[PDB]
Amino acid sequence: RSFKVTACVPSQTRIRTQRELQNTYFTKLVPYDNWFREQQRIMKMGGKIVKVELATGKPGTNTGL
Amino acid sequence: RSFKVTACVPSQTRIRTQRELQNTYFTKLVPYDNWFREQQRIMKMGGKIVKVELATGKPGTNTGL
Amino acid sequence: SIVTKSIVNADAEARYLSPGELDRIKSFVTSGERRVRIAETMTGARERIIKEAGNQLFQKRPDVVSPGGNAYGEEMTATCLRDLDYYLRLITYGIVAGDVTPIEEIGVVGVREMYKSLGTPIEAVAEGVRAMKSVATSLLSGEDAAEAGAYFDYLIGAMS
Amino acid sequence: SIVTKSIVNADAEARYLSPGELDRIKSFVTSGERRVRIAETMTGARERIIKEAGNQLFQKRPDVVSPGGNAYGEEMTATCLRDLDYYLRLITYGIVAGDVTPIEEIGVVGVREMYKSLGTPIEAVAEGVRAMKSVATSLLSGEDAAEAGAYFDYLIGAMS
Amino acid sequence: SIVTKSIVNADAEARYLSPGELDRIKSFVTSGERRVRIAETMTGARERIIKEAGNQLFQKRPDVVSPGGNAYGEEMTATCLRDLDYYLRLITYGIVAGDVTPIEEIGVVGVREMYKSLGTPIEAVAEGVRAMKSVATSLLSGEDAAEAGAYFDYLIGAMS
Amino acid sequence: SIVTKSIVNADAEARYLSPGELDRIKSFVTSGERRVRIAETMTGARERIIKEAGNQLFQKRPDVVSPGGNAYGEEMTATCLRDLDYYLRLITYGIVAGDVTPIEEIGVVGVREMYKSLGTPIEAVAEGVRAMKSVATSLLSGEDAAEAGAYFDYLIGAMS
Amino acid sequence: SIVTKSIVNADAEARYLSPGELDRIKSFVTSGERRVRIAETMTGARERIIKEAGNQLFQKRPDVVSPGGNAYGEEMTATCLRDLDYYLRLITYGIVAGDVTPIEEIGVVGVREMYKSLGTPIEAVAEGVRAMKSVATSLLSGEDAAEAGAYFDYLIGAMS
Amino acid sequence: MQDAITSVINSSDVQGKYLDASAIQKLKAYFATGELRVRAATTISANAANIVKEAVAKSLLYSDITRPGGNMYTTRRYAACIRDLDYYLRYATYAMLAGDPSILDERVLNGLKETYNSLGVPIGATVQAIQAMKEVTAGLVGADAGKEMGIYFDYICSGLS
Amino acid sequence: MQDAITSVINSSDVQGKYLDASAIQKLKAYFATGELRVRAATTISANAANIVKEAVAKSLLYSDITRPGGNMYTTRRYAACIRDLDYYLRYATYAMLAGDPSILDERVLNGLKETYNSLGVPIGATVQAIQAMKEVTAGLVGADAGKEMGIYFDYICSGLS
Amino acid sequence: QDAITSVINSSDVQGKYLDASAIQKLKAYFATGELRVRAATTISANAANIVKEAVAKSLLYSDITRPGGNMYTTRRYAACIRDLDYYLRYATYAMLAGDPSILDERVLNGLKETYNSLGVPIGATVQAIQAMKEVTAGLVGADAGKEMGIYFDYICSGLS
Amino acid sequence: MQDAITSVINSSDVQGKYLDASAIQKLKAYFATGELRVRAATTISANAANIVKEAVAKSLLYSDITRPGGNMYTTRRYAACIRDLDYYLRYATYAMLAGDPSILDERVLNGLKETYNSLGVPIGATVQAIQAMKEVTAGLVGADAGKEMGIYFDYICSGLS
Numbered sequence A, B: 001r002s003f004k005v006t007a008c009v010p011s012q013t014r015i016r017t018q019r020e021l022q023n024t025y026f027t028k029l030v031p032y033d034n035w036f037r038e039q040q041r042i043m044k045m046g047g048k049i050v051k052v053e054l055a056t057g058k059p060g061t062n063t064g065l
Numbered sequence C, D, E, F, G: 001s002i003v004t005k006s007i008v009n010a011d012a013e014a015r016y017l018s019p020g021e022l023d024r025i026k027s028f029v030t031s032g033e034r035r036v037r038i039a040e041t042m043t044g045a046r047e048r049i050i051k052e053a054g055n056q057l058f059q060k061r062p063d064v065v066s067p068g069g070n071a072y073g074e075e076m077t078a079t080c081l082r083d084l085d086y087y088l089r090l091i092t093y094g095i096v097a098g099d100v101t102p103i104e105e106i107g108v109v110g111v112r113e114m115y116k117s118l119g120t121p122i123e124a125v126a127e128g129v130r131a132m133k134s135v136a137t138s139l140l141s142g143e144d145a146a147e148a149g150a151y152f153d154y155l156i157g158a159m160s
Numbered sequence H, I, K: 001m002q003d004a005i006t007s008v009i010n011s012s013d014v015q016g017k018y019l020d021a022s023a024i025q026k027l028k029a030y031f032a033t034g035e036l037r038v039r040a041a042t043t044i045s046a047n048a049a050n051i052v053k054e055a056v057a058k059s060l061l062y063s064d065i066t067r068p069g070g071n072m073y074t075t076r077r078y079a080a081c082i083r084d085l086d087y088y089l090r091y092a093t094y095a096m097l098a099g100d101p102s103i104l105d106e107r108v109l110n111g112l113k114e115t116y117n118s119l120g121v122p123i124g125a126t127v128q129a130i131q132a133m134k135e136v137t138a139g140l141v142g143a144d145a146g147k148e149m150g151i152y153f154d155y156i157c158s159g160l161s
Numbered sequence J: 001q002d003a004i005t006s007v008i009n010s011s012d013v014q015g016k017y018l019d020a021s022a023i024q025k026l027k028a029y030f031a032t033g034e035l036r037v038r039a040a041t042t043i044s045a046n047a048a049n050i051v052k053e054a055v056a057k058s059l060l061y062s063d064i065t066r067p068g069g070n071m072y073t074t075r076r077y078a079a080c081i082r083d084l085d086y087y088l089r090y091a092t093y094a095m096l097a098g099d100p101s102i103l104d105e106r107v108l109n110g111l112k113e114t115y116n117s118l119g120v121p122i123g124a125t126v127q128a129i130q131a132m133k134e135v136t137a138g139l140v141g142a143d144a145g146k147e148m149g150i151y152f153d154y155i156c157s158g159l160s
């Protein structure tokens, strides 16, 4: 099972000559067990997430992963 | 089957010199049919519903009044 | 604005809005541009209007700057012209809102006992805004000082 | 099960699965008719196993039987007796599944942080299922006990 | 020591020590002899502390001395008080240091695994440190016992 | 702030607060009244330090108001002393926050490009805050020259 | 175009166009009439340049025209006319652009999986290209044999 | 009971200064949305009956809530359940003309969370009553006209969850 | 992701209680069909390039989609278009060995509704390309195994368009 | 946003300096700041004994949370009570800061829309929170439970 | 990415008929005005550090936002409102030198509209800043190159609307 996250985050410490639109806005597929850590990493830079509906589906199941 | 609520309403209409203190922090028993009108009367009075207690409710029981 | 008064005259009857009230509120918002140009001349010359309309209070009523009067004292006149500034703030909220309801949510109700407790005469500050009426319409043109003069004469109904 | 344990292994290397896996899946289905025989032996024993082994862990460990333990009380001795009903009914899914992928995710993954929050000794339930293992080999005919007893041995070696 | 972790926090950002941290060094040092006589009461009454803490260890959890557990028998209960001796030596270091990093480097960063690989439940250990909390703060005046209580409670929070 | 420097470091290691860090907050709270009143006499002397600072700037660095400088003409120097007012706007909560980091947000992380993009020399505004340094701490007490002058070293060293 | 990847090679470094690169984009436009006429000759003589060169493929590799082959018969070497015409087309698009990105957009990176799904060895096709290079330069001038053949050597290296 | 003209007056009156010149441009942004919301609100108030009937037909009339055993089996609960839905969109048409969700704050968020778990109606099915509502309005009134309706629609359920 | 084996195991724990004899007959119905569906996996693992070669050569190798214009003109848009075909054929072996159509929902059919729409990719070629691909496998694995894989293969058609 | 720093930040959005309409707000933090570290030392010590008693009666024995429903299998119980540390940890990180804006976005970014996609019962996690609110307030005192009254309720009011 | 050289390559290549007299005329439509377009770029390359300060000096040097109390007041985000003007300038001269809005679709305007909402940033001021940049970029490049650059900046602010 996996999620479809999208989120926006800036960087604070520097001004960058490269474009970084894919770095300031995401639409990523992240699995279930990385998401306990991947969500917390955007909190340290303070970026907001918006739409976090799961794409793999089948919620509330017990077995079958 | 009835309700029990407590609420707080101020009156910024007229300066009232007498005691209005059961008028502002009444707790009350209300019956079931009156309350949707009574909350509506509180809402355009500018009140604040702080707690709706339960104990005379027996909720979910769709029959037996 | 009237959009507040349109809803509470529709929510009290628990209905949607009438088409006559719907044309009423969409005619306010086109006039909502026009009141912004009124308030810019008020907020542009807000330093002008008070500092001699308060003098016309002193020409007409010299009791309050005589000793025995409440506003006598240069620290008291400085708060007095601060006090006359405060109603001109309320007027500039009420031009752009278009009704009396921001003045009827901030500064209208306690004025018989706001100044009883401070001991200032209530008719004196009634004549301060009447001087502040005639100064501020003189900074406007003819047709547009009538809409801003509608809420000048609202406040003297409160004080007198 | 042994399908889905192997199917996710074939997908991770992105290929059609091995003929080494084809002798695995063929022997599972052709021995499945005696595999369902092991599950129905646990149907009529589902009160017989748990009545002896919960008292057997109480005599292997009389730490728990005194006031101050963790099963102590008629809702508290019924806590571990019911959780031993769960772990029996857990792995009887995994007899007929033939591998550990039903038991491990809904039984084994979050345990150590749970039992320290629940205050239960992890060493108690580790030797408690060891008491459950020994009577399971007796009522079955040796070899079919030996293929189903390893899932007990998976459950012992994965708590601590 | 606070001079350890105020260096490595300044070394993490490649910076000098800020003067908001230099007064944390200086006020630690001139009040440092206050921390000596606090710790002298611990080593001055360490036999007093270890006697009337282990009795209520077997009163709030009285089943560790019961058979089927770890601390049953004279030698096996003696490893508990051998391990109770190993705790308050570090809190004697923890008072003097100003930071809890001697307790971090010695006695917490493997306790979560090394006790369930030894057979002692942490929820019984966490009672045993807080049983000392009622007696070690009681053996000192409550001004100096407030900050003395502010070190071993971190270990209970690092057990619980 | 000093609380921010602790609870993002303890947030990173997924831990609670060490009591060595907690007494940095406790010593911050007691030293708040000594810290806030430095900013109260900085806010009273707001229109004092900036006046001679340009007189310390323009008598040593006269190239900006010479023809051939960016701060040429009386409109530009009136904004230039206004921009030095912005740095004093920044400083008077640096002795409220306790350390640098609100200056680090709003003062120093774009200053090497923007003053370069606005045609001004970066050393001259770096001179204007270190010429402000001597006429700010001498305008206050003798002990707190190290306290209020501490955050002036960040403003010197980041631009220069 | 020689513009659009000099754009890409200047985009990744986050830089404008260098004047050393700007002569290369200047000299391409003034020599753009020299390459469109040599691309007219490949547009005009496209039928002769494939028909005899296809027999140079089958003279040097007659494995393809053998039965049981990939491209066997009057209808499947017809498909070699329906495939090699695109490579004769795309070299003209490589000439008028100035570089190899019309080659790189159409017929390079998927040909390892194209011809595997077709079942044709790529180096059998590629020696038809290298024999076509030997007969394309029979039409070109002694100056233009290098530069129009410079886009050929990218295609021979892409297949091999 | 506030409006976006009154909101920018009162939020400036916490500071107590005059009209902020950037904040004047918010009223011009309110003027730009003004003449389209009045054409939006007449579309809702005409079709208010069937748009309750359309929003319950998408996800509520054939599910386990009105399949019997739940609270929507009896009709006097169910006619009140429609009646608790008619006051949602009737208070939502006020929200466009107000230009702030404070009209929802003083009235529909006053005690509605504490009364719904008092009776124990399903909160997520009530969310399912209004996420089905939040598309059927925007399909009927216009795409830009449905854009400022959803910002008051999620203000209900986030205030309800 | 679950099979037909842990389908009944997952329904056993939603109902909580141990699986009964009707649930036993649902599990052992796989075991009567297990030894034949692995016989399909023997011959489909061999010639997996052969099935995706001639299915192109049926109606997708001389076509308008292969001639200028189209979506298989260049070799790179070819290089995904054949790359999708064996990915359907590999996961059809993944579906037909497990009894469940739920494996390829989240691994194949997750984004295929809109990624074929946003890229300007004809599904109507690929729906035409798979019904000829479905018929040639049942000739190659035998009609006893080719039928049961087809309802997992026509499950792909319900999620595609 | 670390409530010293937020009223610093509100001053810069106001633009003007630190006025004595906000200087006493700093003194409001410094008044309760001496108890604030002292209230932190209790809850860091009593960290995970709370979540045993928290869920314990709140919903731990609720059958509907053992049979079949979100929080009932082994892996989803210990994943859920993992966050009950992080709900409790950020409750301290709120009250050390004295501020709800370090809490409105770390724990509370998209968790209304995460937990609907997980199928979490919303009000049951509210019902876990509402009287695990009191059990940490019982040890720290109701005078210290008032600042835990606002910040612990800020999550579930933001979650609903 | 699609250059105007490669676009008129592509328009014959989706048809697959060869480059005609009309198709070579589009290259001669590019090569006849090619010389001024290269010489326009060296003026905009040397002046790009210089020209970026007069765009805000004509628009946003003293305004209602850049004071204390609005956006572009941190000096960190004042770097961003110069660097985005550096971003819009450096990508327009790529789009000038290639002659397309397609590079502008791929690089600068692939997600730029959505991110400006949740950052809470004024869009309409940045519309005026590029629109102020037209009259300063046309004073130095000449009149003839000033109008061909104007349609490329106008694709940005229409794309940012």
Ligand SMILES: *[C@H](C)[C@H]1/C(=C/c2[nH]c(/C=C3N=C(/C=C4\NC(=O)C(CC)=C4C)C(C)=C\3CCC(=O)O)c(CCC(=O)O)c2C)NC(=O)[C@@H]1C
Pocket: F064, F070, F071, F072, F076, F077, F079, F080, F081, F083, F084, F086, F087, F106, F107, F111, F118, F120, F121, F124, F125, F128, K061, K062, K066, K067, K073, K074, K075, K078
């Ligand atoms: C004066 C000692 C130096 C100097 C100043 C100068 N500044 C400007 C114009 C601006 N300066 C800034 C810089 C800041 N503004 C801030 O708010 C802060 C703190 C966050 C800084 C660091 C900005 C943004 C402007 C633009 C106008 C504005 O204030 O918003 C000028 C005018 C230049 C012009 O072209 O108009 C001058 C002269 N220049 C010097 O030579 C001194 C070293």
Ligand SMILES: CCC1=C(C)/C(=C/C2=NC(=C\c3[nH]c(/C=C4\NC(=O)[C@H](C)[C@H]4CC)c(C)c3CCC(=O)O)/C(CCC(=O)O)=C2C)NC1=O
Pocket: B032, B035, B036, B039, B040, B043, H060, H065, H071, H072, H077, H078, H080, H081, H082, H083, H084, H085, H087, H088, H091, H107, H108, H112, H115, H119, H121, H122, H125, H126, H129
């Ligand atoms: C004007 C602002 C305002 C509103 C709207 C309001 C509503 C409100 N809805 C109520 C009940 C109810 N609400 C529902 C709700 C629903 N049924 C469903 O199909 C869905 C799950 C959900 C859709 C909204 C049901 C079934 C009842 C009756 C339950 C009961 O009798 O307790 C009640 C309890 C008394 C009653 O039954 O009327 C009130 C007071 N109060 C207010 O002050």
Ligand SMILES: CCC1=C(C)/C(=C/C2=NC(=C\c3[nH]c(/C=C4\NC(=O)[C@H](C)[C@H]4CC)c(C)c3CCC(=O)O)/C(CCC(=O)O)=C2C)NC1=O
Pocket: C064, C070, C071, C072, C076, C079, C080, C081, C083, C084, C086, C087, C090, C106, C107, C118, C120, C121, C124, C125, C128
């Ligand atoms: C906009 C709504 C609003 C009103 C009306 C308002 C009135 C107001 N008038 C005040 C004082 C005052 N007002 C006056 C007034 C006068 N002195 C004279 O000589 C004249 C007769 C008269 C008018 C010039 C005086 C003298 C005081 C100070 C009280 C005293 O020292 O007696 C004060 C106390 C000072 C302060 O803390 O601000 C308030 C709050 N504040 C508001 O927010």
Ligand SMILES: CCC1=C(C)/C(=C/C2=NC(=C\c3[nH]c(/C=C4\NC(=O)[C@H](C)[C@H]4CC)c(C)c3CCC(=O)O)/C(CCC(=O)O)=C2C)NC1=O
Pocket: D064, D069, D070, D071, D072, D076, D077, D079, D080, D081, D083, D086, D087, D107, D118, D119, D120, D121, D124, D125, J056, J060, J061, J062, J063, J065, J066, J072, J073, J074
């Ligand atoms: C299969 C995964 C799984 C687990 C772990 C589980 C645990 C579980 N343990 C419970 C009680 C309990 N279970 C125990 C367990 C023990 N105490 C002892 O004396 C023994 C040493 C030990 C177990 C062998 C205790 C102490 C409680 C009461 C909670 C407490 O007060 O600590 C309850 C509450 C009663 C109810 O069901 O309504 C649940 C749900 N449920 C599950 O589905």
Ligand SMILES: CCC1=C(C)/C(=C/C2=NC(=C\c3[nH]c(/C=C4\NC(=O)[C@H](C)[C@H]4CC)c(C)c3CCC(=O)O)/C(CCC(=O)O)=C2C)NC1=O
Pocket: E064, E070, E071, E075, E076, E077, E078, E079, E080, E081, E082, E083, E084, E086, E087, E090, E106, E107, E111, E118, E120, E121, E124, E125, E126, E128, E129
């Ligand atoms: C300072 C760093 C440090 C740690 C962490 C440490 C732990 C520690 N505890 C031990 C034993 C022990 N630990 C306990 C624990 C307890 N007694 C009880 O009754 C309570 C439940 C609990 C603590 C309050 C017991 C009963 C033993 C003896 C176990 C045995 O002999 O099998 C042992 C093995 C025997 C020995 O001490 O040599 C170690 C190494 N030793 C150290 O030097």
Ligand SMILES: CCC1=C(C)/C(=C/C2=NC(=C\c3[nH]c(/C=C4\NC(=O)[C@H](C)[C@H]4CC)c(C)c3CCC(=O)O)/C(CCC(=O)O)=C2C)NC1=O
Pocket: G064, G070, G071, G072, G076, G077, G079, G080, G081, G082, G083, G084, G086, G087, G106, G107, G111, G114, G118, G120, G124, G125, I057, I060, I061, I062, I063, I066, I067, I072, I073, I074, I075
């Ligand atoms: C330039 C990019 C490009 C490639 C690679 C391409 C290949 C291509 N080759 C095809 C057929 C074919 N192409 C070949 C080609 C060859 N086999 C031989 O004998 C020769 C060595 C070789 C070429 C001279 C053959 C034999 C077929 C028919 C295969 C069959 O019928 O099974 C088809 C289907 C027919 C059609 O064009 O509609 C395509 C799309 N098309 C393209 O646009």
Ligand SMILES: CCC1=C(C)/C(=C/C2=NC(=C\c3[nH]c(/C=C4\NC(=O)[C@H](C)[C@H]4CC)c(C)c3CCC(=O)O)/C(CCC(=O)O)=C2C)NC1=O
Pocket: I065, I071, I072, I076, I077, I078, I080, I081, I082, I084, I085, I087, I088, I107, I108, I109, I112, I115, I119, I121, I122, I123, I124, I125, I126, I127, I129
């Ligand atoms: C198994 C997991 C998986 C799936 C589901 C998947 C789908 C997938 N198919 C794609 C493209 C494609 N899919 C086709 C499809 C077809 N050709 C046609 O003409 C028909 C309509 C149809 C089949 C005969 C084409 C032509 C492209 C290329 C589109 C392009 O790159 O412009 C792409 C875009 C990137 C790429 O070029 O590969 C994805 C992600 N990829 C994966 O790795």
Ligand SMILES: CCC1=C(C)/C(=C/C2=NC(=C\c3[nH]c(/C=C4\NC(=O)[C@H](C)[C@H]4CC)c(C)c3CCC(=O)O)/C(CCC(=O)O)=C2C)NC1=O
Pocket: A032, A033, A035, A036, A039, A040, J059, J070, J071, J076, J079, J080, J081, J083, J084, J086, J087, J090, J106, J107, J108, J109, J111, J118, J120, J124, J125, J126, J128
């Ligand atoms: C720092 C701010 C913050 C927090 C706290 C946070 C929590 C959080 N709660 C989670 C799951 C969960 N949350 C709950 C909820 C509950 N369990 C109960 O016992 C209660 C009744 C109820 C509330 C505590 C459950 C049951 C799960 C696991 C469900 C699942 O696997 O999806 C997950 C996903 C773990 C997974 O994928 O399985 C995260 C990241 N995220 C954040 O960003």
Ligand SMILES: CCC1=C(C)/C(=C/C2=NC(=C\c3[nH]c(/C=C4\NC(=O)[C@H](C)[C@H]4CC)c(C)c3CCC(=O)O)/C(CCC(=O)O)=C2C)NC1=O
Pocket: A009, A010, A011, A016, A019, A020, A021, A024, K071, K072, K077, K078, K080, K081, K082, K083, K084, K085, K087, K088, K107, K108, K109, K119, K121, K122, K123, K124, K125, K126, K129
């Ligand atoms: C190459 C194409 C491209 C652009 C342009 C781009 C811009 C971009 N602008 C940003 C922020 C920003 N953008 C602006 C924009 C403006 N200032 C205003 O007031 C106006 C509304 C507008 C005129 C320029 C501001 C103020 C910020 C800082 C916002 C913040 O960080 O809170 C950020 C996040 C932080 C950063 O990296 O600076 C990016 C990535 N990214 C890209 O990939």
